[PDB]
């Protein structure tokens, strides 16, 4: 199996959304608190008719369909999600209905979990499966799916929902540079969900910033070390064409890329020019511990990174800014944004990906993009995903109707024995979309289509 990586991708997000500007006004918030301070424009959200299962159905069926993939040709199916539906029965098992109809039940894979990192863990397991002695010559299929918008509180504007499906196989247009990565994992209580009966997390804002930056620095350092062994030169921001990040909100993306410039400063890397050096020098006496909480450092790193950001990062932001936090699918939606925006110039380029999940688990890994024939080509991936079209076909909710919907979702969370209400909503879903009809008295969920 040569050149293993991503062959095909498709993406689903709910058409129902709320504009961040309007939400600012609805809340008691000063203008631009969300659109500038978070860097977020719009928030897609599941109504009562949509959930992680239904969104996965849309994305996988669309992928299978538009790339003309025989479902019998899937040898492994894996799911990343932090959205808990059952404590025992995996989301993977639900998705198997989509293969049973073909009689394809000999399929490896289950669910991977750690916060926003589960989709990455699955992706890597699937790539490793293709390269392994156990590979049977069939495709791997990875699903990242998540939905959560807190009905109340300060975290409500940072919600979102999507499912991404990725077909994995040899001879790919998107190739894993297998040795060029670094991971960081640790036992921390930065952000976790310890109360099984509620969606509210315990958050330690203090620890969480320290944890995320520590993971990012550490992944970058490990990847740089690997690069130095591989290519015999020190890595800098100049050695990749694009940097793609886990993108819960856009401001964190800006800070993340800027932190990489600071790292380059510390390593006296060649991305750091004359003037940049002089900008960072006042901060050369800061300890690492000190570096994580310095606002002044943040702003200078931001000033330095500014020009590189528009070239290397900005094209990865379309979907996350228009949809919101997609949790496990976030990084892959940023990547999908990149393909949408730059497909005709991506052949030959290096793309660095950074995946994070609180608790904490993180990996920075590198991809090389390649010219390939359709249907497994960058151009055909951009065409199939139709991100432009999906964005044009959205339906805006007033913040009012949005808040009522979130209260409704709060009511249906971990609940049994109800029928969803289709009146006014089904009209908004595109033709062929899966939706939740009812959850019976034994918590069993039933779906329709269209």
UniProtKB/TrEMBL annotation:
It is an enzyme of class 2 (transferase). Residues 174-450 form the Hydroxymethylglutaryl-coenzyme A synthase C-terminal domain. PROSITE patterns: HMG_COA_SYNTHASE. Gene3D superfamilies: 3.40.47.10. Its EC number is 2.3.3.10. GO terms for biological process: acetyl-CoA metabolic process; farnesyl diphosphate biosynthetic process, mevalonate pathway; sterol biosynthetic process. One of its GO terms (molecular function) is hydroxymethylglutaryl-CoA synthase activity. InterPro entries: HMG_CoA_synt_AS, HMG_CoA_synt_C_dom, HMG_CoA_synth_N, HMG_CoA_synthase_euk, Thiolase-like. Pathway: Metabolic intermediate biosynthesis; (R)-mevalonate biosynthesis; (R)-mevalonate from acetyl-CoA: step 2/3. Keywords: Lipid biosynthesis, Lipid metabolism, Steroid biosynthesis, Steroid metabolism, Sterol biosynthesis, Sterol metabolism, Transferase. Acetyl-CoA 3 binds at residues 31, 33, 116, 158, 246, 251, 255, 295. Acetyl-CoA 1 binds at residues 30-31, 33, 150, 154, 246, 251, 255, 295. Residues 1-173 form the Hydroxymethylglutaryl-coenzyme A synthase N-terminal domain. It catalyses: acetoacetyl-CoA + acetyl-CoA + H2O = (3S)-3-hydroxy-3-methylglutaryl-CoA + CoA + H(+). The active site is at residues 82, 116, 246. Acetyl-CoA 2 binds at residues 31, 33, 116, 150, 208, 251, 255, 295. Transmembrane segments: none annotated. Pfam families: HMG_CoA_synt_C, HMG_CoA_synt_N. CoA binds at residues 208, 251, 255. Catalyzes the condensation of acetyl-CoA with acetoacetyl-CoA to form HMG-CoA. Belongs to the thiolase-like superfamily. HMG-CoA synthase family. This is Hydroxymethylglutaryl-CoA synthase.
